[PDB]
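Q: What does the assembly look like in three dimensions?
Context provided by user:
Components: ten
Sequences:
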Amino acid sequence: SLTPFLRLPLTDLTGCLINHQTYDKCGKFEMKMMECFEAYGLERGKRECADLISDFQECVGMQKQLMRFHAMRNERYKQWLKGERKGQEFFADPPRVDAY
Amino acid sequence: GWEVGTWYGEPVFKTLPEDTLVTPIFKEFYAHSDWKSYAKRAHLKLWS
Amino acid sequence: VITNNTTLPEESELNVQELNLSSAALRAGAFHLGKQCEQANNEFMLCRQELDDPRACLAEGKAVTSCALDFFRKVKKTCHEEFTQYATCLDKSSGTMAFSHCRKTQGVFDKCIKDNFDWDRPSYGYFSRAKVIQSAREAPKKEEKVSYPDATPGLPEDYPKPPAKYGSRFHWLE
Amino acid sequence: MIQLMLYSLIITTSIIFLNMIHPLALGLTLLIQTIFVCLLTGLMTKSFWYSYILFLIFLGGMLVLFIYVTSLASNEMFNLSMKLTLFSSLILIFMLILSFIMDKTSSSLFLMNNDMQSIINMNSYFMENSLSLNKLYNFPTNFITILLMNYLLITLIVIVKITKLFKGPIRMM
Amino acid sequence: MFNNSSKILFITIMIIGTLITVTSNSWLGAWMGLEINLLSFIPLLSDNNNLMSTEASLKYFLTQVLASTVLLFSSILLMLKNNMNNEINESFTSMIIMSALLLKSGAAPFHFWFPNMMEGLTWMNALMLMTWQKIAPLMLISYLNIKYLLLISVILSVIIGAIGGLNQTSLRKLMAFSSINHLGWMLSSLMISESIWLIYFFFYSFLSFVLTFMFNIFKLFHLNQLFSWFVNSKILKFTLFMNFLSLGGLPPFLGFLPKWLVIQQLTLCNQYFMLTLMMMSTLITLFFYLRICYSAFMMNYFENNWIMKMNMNSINYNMYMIMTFFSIFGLFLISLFYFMF
Amino acid sequence: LRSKYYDHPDGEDAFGKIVATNKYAVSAGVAWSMFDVLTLSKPQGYLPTLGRFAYNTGPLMGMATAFTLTTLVATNARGKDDKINYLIGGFAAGGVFGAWKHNHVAGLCAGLFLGIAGVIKKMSIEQGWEFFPNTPIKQYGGLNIAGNDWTIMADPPKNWTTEKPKE
Amino acid sequence: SAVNDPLELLTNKGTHEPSFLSPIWNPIACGVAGVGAAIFINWGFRKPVFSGIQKHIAFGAIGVGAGAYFDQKRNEYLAKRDAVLRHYIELHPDDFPVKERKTYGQVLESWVPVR
Amino acid sequence: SLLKRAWNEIPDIVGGSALALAGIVMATIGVANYYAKDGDNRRYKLGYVVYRHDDPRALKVRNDED
Amino acid sequence: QIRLLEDEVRRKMSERNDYQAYYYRPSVAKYHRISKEAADELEALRGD
Amino acid sequence: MIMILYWSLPMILFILGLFCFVSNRKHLLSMLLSLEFIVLMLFFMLFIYLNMLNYESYFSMMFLTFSVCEGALGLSILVSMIRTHGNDYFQSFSIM
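A: Here is the predicted structure of the complete assembly.
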């Protein structure tokens, strides 16, 4: 998160606007990362928070997993269009509805 | 170079402790399933 | 996210006798069922909250389902007729399966269960309260604080501040 | 599935919207799209509460600008563009064709619908919009709402001062 | 704050709007403050006695609305990919935010609206636009760290800001092109530090605060009016116009100290080539300032003779004379200032 | 397609250099051309609009190519990569400027403007300094940047310790 | 001494005696500025320049008071500044290592023969 | 007087404000009464809440009858 | 000697931003753990 | 790419909004018409991002409040336009 230069009392007004700290899968992931920013400061934090930033981004942005998912689907379709699969056995057995 | 559970060997969580199970995304949970099964759960609210 | 080294229990272990009992049938015995399996439920539900690993609560979960299945065997043995009428009514009386409609048939069951097992229907708000238990898991989560010995240091207030050498040192000392 | 068809329509109505000239033609195009965007947003959310609000908010703006359109740009012209009708209809069917032969498990948005959430998520069993709208009226974010209030009231002072009601009605002299 | 109690409010809400932007710890919070600021300025700017003023109220509105709109567009996009208010390594998505902010402040490539809306503003309006409205935009650019995009705006700002100003005769339109040049110096000072920028901005506002009053107090809007302007002591008129030289940054006066500290830091940071283009282009800016001084430095003129008397407001003039005095003798007080060390 | 001019010694990789310079020739041409066709010339019709794009960009490509060829040709012909080469290069592009503007004088004088421009660029390459270097000093505060805070809300307790960890 | 210790270089010793005009230049400069500013105001209004000396005394008095206050704060800022540098040197003794002081005997640099 | 003029001109704003003023009053009673009962600690909790016997909250369990 | 050292020192601070003097941007996490507090406060109140 | 499968459509729609805001239409209202078109698309993206958060959609109200005020203020300026020029045509304004 940004650092206002001013930091007058007004920043208290809009500071808590958007966060992840309210019942989120990434609440703990961000607190560690952002804490590390507070410890090392902003500019130096960007060079010491390699793991924490990547983990937090892979927890919210989720690009790392969605971009696994397409590799599986595309590689399932590529096999079939090459004839390596068959129509009857295209997909695996679906999961049970009462799950996840 | 595909490794199961990672993007070509890159773990999708570096900081996490060992054997730290993480619930995958809904879509990833259905990565190997037809659209029918997917829609049977995600659209129960809307009813199609 | 699941990889080879992540350890999931084998399929055989996850297999266990299940209820497979519909919603209305479950809601019928809810109040009498709850008073019995509370010890297992709280033990199971407590770990699941503190510890959010499904495989870790695997042992406790089997206790919860066993208690539920244990309860209905008793009901099947004695009040089979009554319980079916209560469930049938509760199912076919409203779209929500509200208890407020079927008070009559409910009474029939409650008298059957208290004549055969001397149990009592808990008060309406009994299960909505906070339930404090004696943790048999005995492993309440620990507490720690992260340490950064390399944090950007600042000037401490105890540091003495003598006058600057030759002042401003700007151009012509101004 | 209709999500893709919603994608096609919102695209289609946007192409024509770039080509409208008559203000009411713009308005009709915009009104149709406000329906779809409102519909589409609720697909990827735990509730449609915001679609109701957005729809209600914009309809207020829809009426008002007709009142001014009918006073300022009353006398203007339409022109059916056979290039446009074919082009939109051509792509529209083209887009609709794809949505039938699309791997529409891949096209679905990853945002977690209410049903997409797990069964264990205890916070998903409350009222449909309890938690989400909650901290709009709790410390410290409540002061933002309060700040709007002055902002809205102070706005209400701006319009009357810009408007200068007493110096007459509005006509397209 | 000139006519009614309502004008008093809009001024304050402008202050609150600007403060919310520069005290906000996230893009979204910052964007809100811009909206607050937007409607605080328009009613101050719109007056129906002038056909020109309402046109000014328009061009500003369409420009600012687009700027905030595109600004919010990129900010959403920025944290759609990074999930943070900050980008680890600057890229195109951060450039787009910069482009909007420059247009929000009328930097060179997107300055066109800025002079073209100055025809129909009162002098007191121009001061609010020239000085205060440039706080919030420029202060957010300090967060973004793109060099070439920011660098390009500086080079074009000083050039377009100067060359355009030679051809004007309307002082309001002339000051706009003059302000574009000083804007160029800020952005140059902004890629190196802010404390220089905070210092440089304060001096820039100071000088503009002065020149605006002199025109505002005597209601001058065209170059010819300067020659026709009547003053009892041609020595007095001669000295009042010696503020333009400070606005030109000549060292004997206070107005150079700001330029001076921006060079002692740009040079310290090895940006030698930039200073050549900037300082060289400032001469052209210094030129048309002298064209104004034609009405003062020569000091016997052919003037219309149906005026013997000066009618001026006291308090404005009282504060203007104090400000002018430092604008000529303010250099020896550099000793006191301790914000550069 | 992405070639950098100084990737190799001066008398080298002609095709690499021409691409590098024509890159900047096109970009500047289009950038100015966009202003020209909207703000100054304002042509009408989809065809003449291209003429302004070609007119402002075309010869500006000829200049860059001419400088590379003449600079490259001079580097081999004289037997040394020295400043006069870039000076010799500049006059070529200036000559193209006159042909573009149909003006004998404009081409000649502009060559000198371009000629001394190239010389200084070679000066930079040979001495080891840069025109727009990355700032070595970037200041993000005053002296008390970590002290001057005015916020009122009480900061709840900490969660990290500067002290060495305990175990 | 033959050593070049940066911490020694920064550290003060009290030997330097600040000039006479140093503790009075900022007060006296502001005081004269205030009076002179008051002189314009009368001149601007075509009043006798020394009429209404009340305003002269106020501006002169206000100038001195402001000058002394800001001068007092200036030294704290300078005192703190060097304190920062001394502390930073102590934290990174490797980045500011002690260097030995060469003398011209052990160096051979060029000279410029004018001829 | 004032009271009479409004009561004759716009009686609804007087009666309406009379009940509006009632809202603030009995809102001030209820809110104070709420913390006079420690109503933050509610005997019925949304969700399945389980405490450990040693947790500080486990002491504050509101003990009621039904 | 002092203005060739002081200048040198400033470069090291800027090279690594490892001191809270000039080349350090205070990144405050205060507000988020205020939000976490508020969330915890509201967690207790839930219920009727 | 993720951004192409999920965030492309709203962005392409947004730029089409801007190209309406700049095209040459006689009446000023054509700008206002396209103004809240863009706002409608900004809401759509902002609503994508806010939903990546589990419970943060409340900020949609904050955005909508500023949406109407710029439209409401945009409409007021048009009113003031009429009572000095008599009409809202773009070509009626002094080109400077």
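Follow-up: The first strand of chain B starts at residue 6 and ends at 7.
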